Amino acid sequence: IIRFGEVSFSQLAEGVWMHTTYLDLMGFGPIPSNGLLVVNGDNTILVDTAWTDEQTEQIVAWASMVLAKPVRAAVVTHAHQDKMGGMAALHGANIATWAHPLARNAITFDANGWATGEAAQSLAPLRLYYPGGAHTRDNITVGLPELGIAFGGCMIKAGDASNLGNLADADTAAYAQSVRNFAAAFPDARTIAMSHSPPEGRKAIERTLDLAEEL
Amino acid sequence: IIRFGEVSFSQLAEGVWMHTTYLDLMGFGPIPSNGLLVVNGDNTILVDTAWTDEQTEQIVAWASMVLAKPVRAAVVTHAHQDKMGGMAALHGANIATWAHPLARNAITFDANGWATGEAAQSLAPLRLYYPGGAHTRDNITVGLPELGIAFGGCMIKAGDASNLGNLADADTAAYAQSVRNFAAAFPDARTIAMSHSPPEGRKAIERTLDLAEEL
């Protein structure tokens, strides 16, 4: 509900802000894209850039000169092939950047799906989780279990049959396992933030899993 | 605009019918799924089964009984993992079934994307086209060039933002190439039938390609 230039900031819990920037598409209206600012001590961890370089620079300005909690680290969870101007702001601000390769720092995951190594240490208290199984190429997801917050990719909206046909024609079982793993990784999270959509409760999870076994 | 049991048939051109059947989803209503019946001489070629075995048996009965153009071959373009019962009806009627592996008859494609071998011969005048590139795993598409008809997967709707975030977080460039390849394969087709959506004109293609560049 707090506006700072093109960026819109929303508090999900004490010490956790969601940031939302919009992309105008001819004939589709403005399209949200979400991220997190995660306060840790006197610094923040940024989860995802905005659409553009200048939008991302604004978030970095906001953390440093409104929150007095400057960004000391960033993690990518849902990159965009052309809209990667946001990487330049972080590279110019000497903000250490993490992303799952398969960003100068690679996040590796263990066979349980949890991030390991320096990456897990540097981004705590965020818990980075990779939900996919063999042959998958999912985006990573992140959670704050103690606050009941999980952050993942776009799920089926209530009442919207728009993406149902794509779901039936894809690897429904693989998609379903990914959603099941994510659900079980953050089993107590009742706020499910989304990459390009506002948060929902766990009804969103259950709704997607019903569809996968119904088609 | 002609109804037979659970199946609904629409004539796209002389000798070409689209068949539509519905799947009731709790909270989402009925979801269409489309295929084609393609008259060739005194027989028909069936493109895709319906949702259910019993709906598919209705389709073979219609061809044999109303059209008197009995189904002599079938090709799969968008299989469903759980709704595989429609294959049982085909194998019971001793209908030869063709499908692209990556249905005991495999369709192979050449480096131009066109089907080859006995498959192309047996399914003519359907032209079978594989639209993807390296590392892709697209569904096949089919066209009747002389009739200006092409049949593909589900595409973005006008004004519909539901799928937009999923599109930015996928391999937009790979998706875009597939749509461009499909467009160039049937460049004169003005009727684009869809796997789970009513037909549109070429505006559907251009709209999808416009998004992929802006994402």
Ligand SMILES: [Zn+2]
């Ligand atoms: Zn995204």
Ligand SMILES: [Zn+2]
């Ligand atoms: Zn389908």
